[PDB]
Structure formats: structure tokens, C-alpha cells
Amino acid sequence: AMIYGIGTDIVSLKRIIRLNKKFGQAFAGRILTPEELLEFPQAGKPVNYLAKRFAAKEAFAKAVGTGIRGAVSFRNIGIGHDALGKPEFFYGPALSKWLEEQGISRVSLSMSDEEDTVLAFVVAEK
Amino acid sequence: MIYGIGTDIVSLKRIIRLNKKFGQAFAGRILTPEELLEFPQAGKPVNYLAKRFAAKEAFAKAVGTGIRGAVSFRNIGIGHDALGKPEFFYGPALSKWLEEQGISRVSLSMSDEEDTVLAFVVAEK
Amino acid sequence: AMIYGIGTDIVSLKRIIRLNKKFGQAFAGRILTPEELLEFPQAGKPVNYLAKRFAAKEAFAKAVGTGIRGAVSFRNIGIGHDALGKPEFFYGPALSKWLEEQGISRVSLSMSDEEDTVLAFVVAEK
Ligand SMILES: CC(C)(COP(=O)(O)OP(=O)(O)OC[C@H]1O[C@@H](n2cnc3c(N)ncnc32)[C@H](O)[C@@H]1OP(=O)(O)O)[C@@H](O)C(=O)NCCC(=O)NCCS
Ligand SMILES: CC(C)(COP(=O)(O)OP(=O)(O)OC[C@H]1O[C@@H](n2cnc3c(N)ncnc32)[C@H](O)[C@@H]1OP(=O)(O)O)[C@@H](O)C(=O)NCCC(=O)NCCS
Numbered sequence A, C: 001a002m003i004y005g006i007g008t009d010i011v012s013l014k015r016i017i018r019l020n021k022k023f024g025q026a027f028a029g030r031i032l033t034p035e036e037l038l039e040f041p042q043a044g045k046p047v048n049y050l051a052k053r054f055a056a057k058e059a060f061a062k063a064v065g066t067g068i069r070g071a072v073s074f075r076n077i078g079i080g081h082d083a084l085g086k087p088e089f090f091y092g093p094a095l096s097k098w099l100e101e102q103g104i105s106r107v108s109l110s111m112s113d114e115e116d117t118v119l120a121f122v123v124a125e126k
Numbered sequence B: 001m002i003y004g005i006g007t008d009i010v011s012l013k014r015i016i017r018l019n020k021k022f023g024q025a026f027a028g029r030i031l032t033p034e035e036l037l038e039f040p041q042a043g044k045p046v047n048y049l050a051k052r053f054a055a056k057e058a059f060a061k062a063v064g065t066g067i068r069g070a071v072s073f074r075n076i077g078i079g080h081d082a083l084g085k086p087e088f089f090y091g092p093a094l095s096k097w098l099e100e101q102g103i104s105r106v107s108l109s110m111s112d113e114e115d116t117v118l119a120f121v122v123a124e125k
């Protein structure tokens, strides 16, 4: 009744590097929201920036129970940050609409990385 | 509120080593009867075993006891709902124990990358 | 009841070794609480001990939304264990007070390790 779903994702930087090589310059544009893409050039570690967002979006998609499908899409799931640096989700309008319809009230996020591994942790509440 | 949380990471190489030590009987000791029905057809059997092992260890940590008593590999079953979300199903001894503790719902998420399988579990009371 | 925040951390044992090597015992003196620092000489696996505490404290600081800041400090975030071995937090008095001011009622902890990777997950409620 409290938790709608939980999600975790572990993403290797190597995996992101291979995807970015395979799909070329267009890859970032397929995984990132327009806001994320606008701020990507200022990332200190671009590969890590993509990997974190990739992991966060997959973990989100698990926490809401559907996987990447329909409105639960890379382009609709954006990661932003509050004034203290805490990561938080911001949604394309098709996804905020879907979330309200599912009764999902809020979705929390945490991320970490170490060496070649990025980790995301998501909890969706009712 | 939350009763507890649990997490576990499992090496695919480790599961391989455990298979060699105990033979195919290892799977018979980690998996439930229902899991054992589809296990012979599993396309990636090391990954299949690793996921179940990690999930069951995480479950055991999330209920605060570890693998002990009714909290045992053979009582902790993983299934999936219609959309592919993993979810737990319990043997009778474990389902009773959980309810005795007031634990109402246990949620599960799994991920894997290269050699690492990761499970995270939240038990709610 | 609701979630205040969630936190995760992954920590490499090799990174801990590097940190011990550069700073010597001053690293443990910076990360451990006075209580933990007294029992550290008895840890059967001092690198694994420091790694778990480091990951748990970092995940804690994320779960309360601040990072390491103010009273949310390494020296105020302690790890103990209950009778069955379940890990749990204890707090320096200033942090206990802050948690109470914030309405945080319970912070849950889980840890795991495999090979070089130590992992911590934390959920702060209310
Ligand atoms: C779930 C998803 C986000 C990721 O799948 P993945 O990263 O390949 O798989 P992971 O190893 O991280 O985790 C898989 C686990 O997800 C979990 N999962 C699957 N479907 C799920 C769902 N609907 N809800 C919650 N969890 C789910 C399962 O536990 C699965 O492991 P199991 O089946 O062995 O239990 C999926 O929705 C997807 O579409 N992946 C492809 C993403 C993609 O498009 N990449 C290309 C970039 S353009
Ligand atoms: C605790 C257990 C669940 C996991 O053992 P493990 O995998 O070695 O433990 P992990 O390394 O995953 O995580 C260790 C952490 O578990 C946590 N933990 C221990 N007991 C716990 C408990 N009762 N409740 C919650 N968390 C617990 C602790 O934080 C511990 O690390 P710390 O003591 O350093 O803080 C154990 O009971 C277990 O089941 N081991 C293997 C089971 C087995 O039989 N394997 C052979 C195949 S038959």
C-alpha cells in the first residue's frame, strides 16, 4: 500500500561506450531528454553522465512495473537535481499523466558510481 | 512502514564454482519445486540461478534473519507478473512466518551486468 | 508514513586501500565515529570494515538529502548490528537532534559485498 514498486540498475561504463560507438553521435540524443541533452556538453565526465541517466531510467522503468514501454521512455524520464545536489525525476507530460493514472504519487532516486560501474536505486510510492 | 531492506550481489563465476562443488544438486538446494520445473529449459542457467540466489539472500536480509528457519531457499520463490516484474511467492512455512512478523508485502528488483547480479528487496509491515 | 529519501553507494575495496595508503590511519580517523574508531583495531577485516562503513555513511547522507554536510557527518553516522546481525545506524547527538527536527523516524540499512565491490542501500522514512 505504501510502495508501488522498486527498481535498481547496474550499468558498466564499457557498455555505454560500446553503445555510443555503435549508434554514433546520435546515441546521447536517444537516451537523454532535451534538458539533459542541453546540459550534456557541460558534463565533466560525459560517459559517466550518460551511464547514470541510463541506469536511472532503467531503474525507474522497473520501479513503475513496466520496463521501458509506452510513455515510460528514455525521452520522458529526466533526471535533475535540487539545491543540495539530490537527484530527482522530472517528466515529459505523457509520463506525468500516466503516473497520475497509475496512482504513483512520487518516485525517488539515488545514484552512485565506482570504477566501471554505475548504480541506480529507485522507489516509487503510491 | 518499512520492516526492513535487503540487498545482495552475486558473481556469475561464484555460482559456477558452487555448481562444480555440489553438482546439479546445487540448483536443487537453492530453487523451489516450482522454479525447478522450468529450470531445465532455462536459456541462461547460471544467470537464472544467480538471480534466484541473490533474490533469496536479499529477501533473507530484508526480513532481518538471514537464511534461517522458515527463511530458506526452498521457501522463497521468485515469479513474474504479466509485465515481467519479478515478485515473491512463499512456501507455507515462510508465508506463515512472514505473517507472524506482521510483514505485509515484500517487493523485489533485480539487475545484472557482466559477472554481477544485483537484488534489492523491501519488506513492508 | 512516507519516504524521506533513499540512498545508495558502491565502494571498491581497492579504493579504500589507496585511501589508507595515501593518508595512513588518518583516513579511518576521518570516516569512523569515535565509537567505531575504538573497536577498529579489533576488526577481522579492516579494509572490508572501513569499506562497509564508508558506503553506509555515504548512502545515509544521500538518503537524508544533504550529502556530507553539517551534522550529517562521518563522525556522527555510526553502524552497529542487532542480535541477529542486521546492520543498523546509531547517531551522534547532534544528528539525532537533526533527524528529529526533520521528522525522520527510522533509517534502514542493508549491505552486501562480492569480490571488490561493497554495496549499501538506505531508506529514510517520514
Ligand atoms: C527492464 C529494462 C529497463 C531493462 O532490461 P535490462 O537492463 O536488459 O535487464 P537488467 O539485467 O537490468 O534487469 C533485468 C531484470 O529486470 C526485471 N524486470 C523485467 N521486466 C520488468 C518490469 N516490467 N518491471 C520491473 N522489473 C522488471 C527482471 O527481474 C529482470 O531480471 P529476471 O527477468 O531475471 O528477473 C527493459 O525495460 C528494457 O527495455 N531494456 C532495453 C533498454 C534499451 O532500449 N536499451 C537500448 C538503448 S537505445
Ligand atoms: C546473511 C546471509 C543471508 C548472507 O551471507 P553473505 O552472503 O555472506 O552476506 P553478504 O556478504 O551478502 O552481506 C553481509 C551482510 O549481511 C548483513 N546481514 C547479516 N546478517 C543479517 C541479518 N540477519 N539481517 C539483515 N542483514 C544481515 C550484514 O551487514 C553483513 O555484513 P556486516 O555484518 O559486515 O554488516 C547468510 O545467511 C547466507 O544465507 N549465506 C549463504 C547461504 C548458503 O547456504 N549458501 C550455500 C548454498 S546451500
Ligand SMILES: CC(C)(COP(=O)(O)OP(=O)(O)OC[C@H]1O[C@@H](n2cnc3c(N)ncnc32)[C@H](O)[C@@H]1OP(=O)(O)O)[C@@H](O)C(=O)NCCC(=O)NCCS
Pocket: A052, A084, A085, A086, A087, A110, A111, A112, A113, A114, C009, C010, C030, C058, C061, C062, C063, C064, C065, C066, C067, C068, C069
Ligand atoms: C554525496 C557524496 C557523499 C557523493 O559521494 P561520491 O562518492 O562523491 O559520489 P557517488 O558517485 O557515490 O554519488 C554521487 C551522487 O550523489 C548524489 N548526491 C549528491 N548530492 C546529493 C544530496 N545532497 N543528496 C542525495 N544525493 C546526492 C548525486 O546523484 C551524485 O551523482 P550526480 O551528481 O551525478 O547525480 C558527497 O558529495 C558528499 O556529500 N560528501 C562526501 C565528501 C567527503 O567526505 N568525501 C570523502 C572525504 S574522506
